[PDB]
């Protein structure tokens, strides 16, 4: 969505504005402007700037990262069962019978 352009700005009543615009138009016709343009935006960059095809998951497989949160549901049960089992030593001091 271009439309607008970059420009050089001047005080009102500067006479040089016309000389600048003339020389800029000459440089645009004379091709020199295309050299300075190419100089700073050379096409042959390191990588494609535009492709986002760029995908990580391809095999659709579940793996030891994506699934692994479920294992914390097991671990909670393991820990809680260990904690509860050790309450034998707390209660059996005075349970009345073991």
């Amino acid at each position: 969505v271009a439309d607008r352009g970059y420009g050089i700005a001047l005080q009102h009543g500067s006479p040089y504005r016309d000389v600048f615009s003339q020389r800029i138009l000459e440089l645009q016709q004379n091709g020199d402007m295309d050299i300075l343009k190419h100089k700073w935006w050379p096409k042959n960059g390191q990588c494609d700037l535009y492709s986002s095809v760029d995908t990580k998951q391809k095999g659709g497989a579940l793996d030891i990262k994506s699934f692994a949160g479920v294992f914390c549901i097991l671990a909670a049960g393991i820990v809680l069962s260990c904690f509860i089992a050790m309450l034998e030593t707390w209660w059996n001091k005075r349970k009345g019978s073991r």
Partner: protein, 49 residues
């Protein structure tokens, strides 16, 4: 169509070197004026080594 085939990434593609097809795609590739990323992507698929 040429657009998707030039913008997909699963299928490698090319031609016979020194052909008019190769010279045409090289001309569209090397030129910094050329506009559609089609031609740069085709050249980048070709210009691998």
């Amino acid at each position: 169509s040429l657009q998707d085939l030039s913008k997909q990434t699963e299928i490698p593609y090319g031609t016979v070197l020194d052909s008019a097809v190769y010279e045409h795609v090289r001309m569209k590739g090397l030129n910094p004026f050329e506009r559609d990323s089609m031609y740069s992507q085709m050249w980048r698929m070709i210009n691998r080594s």
